[PDB]
Amino acid sequence: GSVHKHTGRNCGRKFKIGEPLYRCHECGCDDTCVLCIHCFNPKDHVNHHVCTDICTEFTSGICDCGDEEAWNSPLHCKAEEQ
Ligand SMILES: [Zn+2]
Ligand SMILES: [Zn+2]
Ligand SMILES: [Zn+2]
């Protein structure tokens, strides 16, 4: 897979139509806190309650990975791995 890391800053990537927005009940500050396909690390959320929403004309936004206000726990962005 190809990767473009956002290290030392937030992701902020705008979801493309059709993509999942991931939320985690445990990690999210609230229900508007979301991660993109590039960032969501399944390892961070094994014992967690995760839901996806799907990007449409009316459901969109930007990825909160790297924005510390959005998360209760340290996230390990998927893009940073190898
Ligand atoms: Zn992202
Ligand atoms: Zn990320
Ligand atoms: Zn989580």
Residue 76, domain CATH: 2.10.110.30
Full domain range(s) for residue 69:
11-82
Resolution of the entry in angstroms: 2.0
4 is written with which tokens? 């473009």
67: CA distance to ligand 1 center in Å? Answer: 10
**Does 77 count as an annotated binding residue?**
yes
CB 7 within 8 A of CB 80: yes
79 is written with which tokens? 């893009």
Q: Is residue 27 part of a domain?
A: yes
Q: Which ligand is nearest to the CA of 49?
A: 3
* Closest C-alpha among 13, 2, 1, 24 to residue 66: 13
The two beta strands, 50-54 and 20-24, are antiparallel
Q: Is residue 5 part of a domain?
A: no
**Does 24 count as an annotated binding residue?**
yes
Instruction: Report the number of distinct structural domains present in the chain.
Output: 1
Q: Is residue 3 part of a domain?
A: no
Give the C-alpha separation, 2 to 55, whole Å.
Answer: 21
Write a three-state SS string for the chain.
CCCCCCCCCCCCCECCCCCEEEEECCCECCCCCCECCCCCCHHHHCCCCEEEEECCCCCCCECCCCCHHHECCCCCCHHHCC
Residue 52 burial (CB < 10 Å; 0-12/13-18/19+)? middle
